């Protein structure tokens, strides 16, 4: 029954998920446009932790001593201090990180950090570290402006919808917002300069791999997602106070008016 | 909110025994069931009752009645569905068939 119901659902070339009549089921597949097989469980570092821990992890101040950075972290560790424009860049980056923290806390009420996201940033960082032989002692060649502008350009290059109008651009931003939150969570100035200690070539290589993997993880138009969903729901049912299992699935799909255990929850 | 509750119910059913199914499959299911403004049941009286083509609809349940109603109503089937092309034995517009492969004379001459 499920397969017959979902047999005509398909992802078309404008990323909308339509049936045989052309009716729009989803304006983008899976609400992110990503192939299911290219999704891995990853942790969102912004949503978790404490405010003091969050500041220690992300906040970088070039004008004070409470949240300053070790000048030995990067090559220009003694020239950045006292700068005004770079401090503006850090201010806006940390403001964006705080906005992402609030947004993710709004999306997940329980604050769950590990969620399925397309591209595994951690493995890319580890691959760069092992390939470029990060000695963790030499000051990084990266400049902070380089990090900020590279992250911004990388976000600009994560394209799911290629349209050239405001509707499609807004949908593209809404589709890539969560992965951009993860990317900003991982590729922060403090984290890149201290926790990972990327170099210029290593940072550029990381950016290139993130962009390539994200563009590879996009769902392919022509994917028969309806039959895929029907099978991915029916097959686990074969392996199987309140009714559950096969009878509850039967009740749900039939949308039966009368149900065995009609229960309600009050908070 | 009905679609959200339907997805939560389906997810609870799936994860009751500890199994995990990706979000997007159940999301597609609950979006199909709630795309008409009301909860569409997965049954002949449910999805099988939709102007989505006589040949597709009949292949599920109540075949001859569907054919009779289509003949009486003079329905036009556009053969955009998988079941129509399966019945007619032609490449369905799915997967590899979701597009047309053509030949560029100018490019072929450009090669040599």
């Amino acid at each position: 029954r499920l397969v017959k119901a979902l047999e005509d659902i398909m992802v078309h070339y404008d990323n909308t998920t339509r049936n045989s009549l052309g009716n729009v089921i989803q304006f983008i597949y899976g609400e992110d446009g990503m192939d299911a097989a290219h999704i891995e469980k990853q942790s969102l570092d912004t949503i978790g932790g404490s405010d003091a821990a969050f500041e220690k992890r992300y906040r970088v101040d070039l004008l004070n001593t409470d949240h300053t950075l070790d000048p030995s972290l990067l090559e220009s560790g003694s020239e950045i201090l006292g700068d005004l424009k770079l401090q503006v860049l850090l201010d806006e980056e940390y403001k964006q990180l705080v906005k992402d923290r609030k947004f993710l806390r709004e999306v997940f009420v329980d604050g769950e950090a590990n969620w399925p996201l397309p591209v595994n940033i951690r493995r890319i960082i580890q691959n760069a570290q092992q390939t470029f032989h990060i000695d963790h002692t030499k000051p990084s060649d990266l400049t902070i402006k380089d990090i900020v502008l590279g992250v911004k350009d990388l976000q600009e290059n994560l394209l799911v919808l290629r349209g050239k109008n405001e509707i499609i651009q807004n949908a593209q931003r809404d589709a890539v917002t969560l992965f951009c939150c993860l990317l900003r969570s991982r590729l922060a100035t403090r984290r890149v300069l201290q926790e990972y200690r990327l170099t210029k070539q290593a940072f550029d290589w990381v950016l290139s791999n993130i962009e390539a993997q994200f563009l590879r993880s996009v769902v392919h138009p022509g994917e028969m997602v309806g039959v895929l969903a029907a099978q991915s729901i029916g097959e686990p049912a074969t392996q199987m106070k309140v009714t559950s299992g096969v009878p509850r699935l039967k009740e749900i799909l039939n949308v039966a008016k009368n149900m065995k255990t009609p229960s309600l929850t009050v908070y | 909110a009905g679609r959200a509750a339907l997805y939560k119910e389906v997810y609870n059913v799936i994860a009751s025994d500890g199994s995990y199914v990706n979000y997007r499959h159940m999301a597609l299911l609950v979006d199909v069931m709630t795309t008409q403004g009301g909860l569409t049941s997965v049954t002949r009286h449910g999805f099988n009752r939709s102007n989505t083509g006589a040949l597709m609809r009949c292949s599920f349940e109540e075949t001859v009645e569907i054919l009779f109603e289509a003949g009486a109503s003079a329905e036009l089937d556009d053969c955009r569905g998988v079941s129509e092309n399966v019945i007619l034995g032609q490449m369905a517009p799915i997967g590899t068939g979701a597009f047309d492969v053509m030949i560029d004379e100018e490019s072929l001459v450009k090669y040599m």
Partner: peptide, 10 residues
């Protein structure tokens, strides 16, 4: 119901 287990009704 259903059928099986029309409707109800019809």
């Amino acid at each position: 119901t259903x059928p099986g287990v029309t409707x109800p009704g019809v």
